[PDB]
Design a protein around this ligand. Sequence first.
Ligand SMILES: [Cl-]
Ligand SMILES: [Cl-]
Length: 162
Amino acid sequence: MNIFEMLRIDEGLRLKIYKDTEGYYTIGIGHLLTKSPSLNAAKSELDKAIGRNTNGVITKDEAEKLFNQDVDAAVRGILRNAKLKPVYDSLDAVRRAALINMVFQMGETGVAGFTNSLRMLQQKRWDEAAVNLAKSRWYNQTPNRAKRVITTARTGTWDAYK
Ligand SMILES: [Cl-]
Ligand SMILES: [Cl-]
């Protein structure tokens, strides 16, 4: 199992614009198109992102192309971030995938804000980190996905995804 397969499980694949959990216009593999209520602003962004006139529909390849760009941006966002970087450098490869999942989902800023949890992740205090991570809107809004990511972080194994 790897970050890509982990995220494709968590986000699904949709070839047609849809709304996310939060209500935002999304497409492919968790690719947020806009937070604007307009489906027309969504089609615009979508067309921009893809380089073509899509009419709200994309091919599998296109969805994969977007996903590759997003995981990449996610990793680079982590390594460019003064709050995130140290935590990541300190982690083994499984737990790293966990932080990457979070950043893909909630943006760098979002995660960078989990101050306390990042600190316990750094100090390798797994259980406590797991408990603190659960005290978040994130966990309350998307409990099953969050529980999965959180267990990956606590344990350093891919069990929750098996
Ligand atoms: Cl884009
Ligand atoms: Cl969920």
